[PDB]
Assembly symmetry: D2
Homo-oligomer: 253 residues x 4
């Protein structure tokens, strides 16, 4: 079995691929632009990926990998400004370049399924786009389109940490994402079946993508304070889910 994993409580550019306005400052990963006085900047777009590609599956052996990632983000909006646009954890083709800005979160080009996009992402959408978005702020699973295949309402706690955990079990083909705001003791979870070997390539780069709104008052920050990831690829078709117990304690807690 092939295993790849990492856990960062402190960020330093070397081990990451930064695109757009993504930068590393004070050890945290800042996905979008921020003026010196601390206020967010509109029309921003940043992405960051682990410098090592991860093999999601192997066409020769029919083995599919089971993986998990956990990270803490802090989304803050200036006093009188509205939230926009959101951040997303994504699996993209190794060479991939940023896509449309604004409501596309820098990972998709349209709200129409396009298998050739070869991108899967779990988004934390802070602005409802009338053309494909649910009524309020939400968490959603996007498979080759910005129109999520499943969503769940989310009560964003401005300025308070959000602890996220996303897992994929090759045995049940189930992708699950949960978010927790410790400060408020609120928690949200969402799950859906995703045939990964059909929506993505054998190798992908894992990371984040965030964008701020295209208007003067639709802004927010996107700071990743810590990030963990672990992947396991078997040798036969026989899938083996991961050990989350041992994972979180050895990585998140």
């Amino acid at each position: 079995a092939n295993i790849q994993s990492f856990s960062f409580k402190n960020f330093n550019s070397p081990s990451f691929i930064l695109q757009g306005d993504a930068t590393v400052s004070s050890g945290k990963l800042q996905l979008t632009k921020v003026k010196e006085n601390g206020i967010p900047t509109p029309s921003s777009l940043g992405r960051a990926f682990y410098s090592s590609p991860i093999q999601i599956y192997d066409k020769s052996t029919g083995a599919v990998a089971s993986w998990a990632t956990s990270f803490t983000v802090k989304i803050s909006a200036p006093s009188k400004a509205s939230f926009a646009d959101g951040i997303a954890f994504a699996l993209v083709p190794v060479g991939s370049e940023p896509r449309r800005n604004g409501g596309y979160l820098g990972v998709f080009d349209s709200d129409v399924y396009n298998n050739s996009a070869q991108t899967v992402a779990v988004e934390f959408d802070t602005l409802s786009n009338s053309g494909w978005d649910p009524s309020m702020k939400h968490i959603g699973i996007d498979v080759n389109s910005i129109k999520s295949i499943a969503t769940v309402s989310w009560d964003l706690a401005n300025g308070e940490n959000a602890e996220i955990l996303i897992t994929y079990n090759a045995a049940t083909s189930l992708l699950v994402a949960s978010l927790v705001h410790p400060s408020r003791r609120t928690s949200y979870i969402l799950s859906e079946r995703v045939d990964i070997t059909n929506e993505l390539p054998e190798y992908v780069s894992v990371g984040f993508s965030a964008t701020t709104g295209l208007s003067e008052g639709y802004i927010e920050t996107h700071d990743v304070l810590s990030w963990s990831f672990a992947s396991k690829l078997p040798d036969d078709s026989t899938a083996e889910p991961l050990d989350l117990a041992s994972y979180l304690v050895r990585n998140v807690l």
Copy 2:
């Protein structure tokens, strides 16, 4: 730092403490009694704990441990029978003996807070007891009483696997529990703050406790198919949450 962990995909009595009707057959952990023909038995009560005690905290250093557990259970009710009574993951005093049967799930004595009970458990209640239970089937966090301090409705999928994950972060004092029915793509999550050092002793035994109903037709099985656990105790007061990413992949997926 002190660490203790284990992951069982196959059960064998030696490493576990069995009480009541709990038994190990065909490698799975069967908490309640079952007639030879496969049908569940009423008025049953079984418990099982890892043979090694786990230190939840240290009074001398002020360090509190962060831990996580994940397991898969299959709860089945004969064709025309009703569900009862439920199973619970619990932290109990090392020498502890089973308590009241029936709706008390074998871990509590009353629906009134009794700090001296020194027991905390996350229950998966399949029968609503008018005196302290919510309207329907639910997941709840019990702190020294059978009346949960917080609950969440749960749509039990008869005979289908339930993948559970419970975590405790010493930094936020937050206890979170989530349940997923892969077969139905449904998922539930629930969280609440719990001052562990006040509700439990320094050392505890971790395991399960399940009971069936006290009537002829209120029965169900309680098979644990796999179980993982991991605990980390720091050396100073400074708490450190676990790495769930690395945990699940190295343990659950």
Copy 3:
């Protein structure tokens, strides 16, 4: 696969089984007796094992486990006293009681192979017993007898830490033990093939056993300052060696 592991940098009686003069003081594991003034006591014998039994193999599936343990010991002899008798890491039958004292290190009864003894131990012998011992101080692998099947000279550094690592690879049936005295930059290693399923039972208790000499001037201390262990049991006959890289960093370094 079944996994069991733990790592203690600080000791506390609850999770261990203590026999003889073994005690836990100031957080370290003291295997042999020591007078209040700090000097060792002759004719001492202490043993300590993890409170959870470990399954070395499964007769039904033909699976053999691969495991590894690492610990730091400090062996000190008063100014003008001679060294005796040694400490040993051992795998013994779950219910096992201490055996002969003195040169038998509390784990064996004779220097003649007795399969029914069902004990395997890696010893760090500090006193040469004319009847079965090599010329000087040594590390040896004992399989059901106090006469090691293989040994290696060892230059004990009085009062300086010794970092030990012992591993067993089910695939090569090879047992390897290495000792390092960081302070002196000296290192020793020793390896031998051992058909474990023939020399031990399915379940064993892992721990230490140490004894001091039976004479007024043959004494030394045996303090274990930290201890790690990890075991993995597959589901088919197909053995899988462990990941020492990930093991030491996640446990020893």
Copy 4:
């Protein structure tokens, strides 16, 4: 703490940086050239590194990382040919290009200490170079020069697997390397203190480098069959050795 780790039992180019004649075939990592008929090629040179750089230390916090790597190599020499030149595990500057071939193993330029070389490597030298090499085949620790600072004789078993483990403990500043030939039950170990923060940069690329002899009959193959690595970087100066127990079982065994 920052952690990075991986374990490959099967190789696939994507996650690695290949230089020279290094190639991935049949899943194994072949460092040097080999004719289609299977015989090795002279004057060869290949290198391979994990695609993600690893931070060995942080100048700002004074924290030094503790790491460990384990891999299996198979060195074979055609019937009537002599061995040359060797393989080496090395830590090199992130952008680094191969160096001198032949007896320099592709990582060094001279047998004279040159701190600016910023390279540390543990070599498995199969050919004695009169100008800086010990009498026979050996394992050695090279710090910015091809003249090892310490060596140990090694009896190479032609065509038989060699299981290697190299560790670095930031607390003792000790680098230890051990080699085992399971087939022969032989084992070798070697250790030396190395002030890493003085010999290497903050970030390095970890991998292998191998070369064959510059003559018609001095050849041998260099196949890496599996490779594990794990690194842990603390947040304060306080170093913390790794858990090799948990590492090997979770990675090597």
